[PDB]
Amino acid sequence: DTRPRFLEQVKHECHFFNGTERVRFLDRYFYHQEEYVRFDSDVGEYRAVTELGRPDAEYWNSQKDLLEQKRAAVDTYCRHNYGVGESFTVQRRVYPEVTVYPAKTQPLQHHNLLVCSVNGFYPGSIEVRWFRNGQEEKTGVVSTGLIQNGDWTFQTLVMLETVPRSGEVYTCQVEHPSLTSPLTVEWRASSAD
Amino acid sequence: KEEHVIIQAEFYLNPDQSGEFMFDFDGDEIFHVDMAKKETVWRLEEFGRFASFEAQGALANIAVDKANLEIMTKRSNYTPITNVPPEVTVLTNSPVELREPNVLICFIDKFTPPVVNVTWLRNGKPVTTGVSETVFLPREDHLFRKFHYLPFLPSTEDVYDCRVEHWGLDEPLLKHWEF
């Protein structure tokens, strides 16, 4: 079955700024990936985004009750649903599991990659820093970036390229909204000599 | 800059007659409606503790999406969708340790239309038991993403692959994991 396909999408979007102080509602209609018509609460009426949507913007904007409903959506829909979901979405905070390990078993005084694996956290905003004997390392730091697991958790792996020497202590530090106190995990080069 | 975004995302696809109705918060699924069973399906059980959604309302919306699709298909002179093949990544949920239960994640990203076949393979054989998957998740570029999951017990003996088939690909796409 390789028959041609035809896709309609609709996205009713609520964008929230400073809690619910400012809200923007978008009613967005798509043919394949192409948005063709949109209501934006900052505009207050439908507008064609492409020529495919011209017939709809005119037709819907001529219905007064229809527009009044869309214009109230910032409250009836957006702020309403924010309130419903707040405790388990906006206020969801899941503390990270942090593991530090060398990427390969290597003798000291040779190149290695030290891995700081930060797993299972929420929300996505995070800072992960590497230190060598208390001095922050900025160069030779490579990461996976932020990875969504699909289950309302994230992970990231943050790697430090280094040549570890006897007696050195490397530290991975995590800053994240779930923390009530600092999160650091050490790797001692003398523990893997 | 915005703090949060909630999206009610829907689609209807011809000639498959397939549809979807879901809510997204900052890129994660809150729920979708199983329109065969007319049931609200929460992404995490805990979300249904306090919140509710009238699943029948989704069917009404999908009927409008169908009617709209018919109109837009005519307006476009039957311009069909261009297939965009997925980018696939296999991940583990946590750092892997021998004989410590873990989960393989197959992340299927940046594709359309929202029709895909995903099969977990253990030593080349399809795994049917213990697997789970998400519905199609919307992207800001109006493509889709999806996750498939396989709980597993890590061993030196087993190898795994996520096999993905999509109209945009020239062959099945295999992404490998082994210890």
């Binding site: 017939p55 037709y59 959506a73 829909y77 649903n81 | 306090f50 509710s52 919306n61």
Partner: peptide, 14 residues
Amino acid sequence: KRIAKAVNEKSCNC
């Protein structure tokens, strides 16, 4: 509490 559904508008058959 109940999550509110946004309605879809119906395109002009034109």
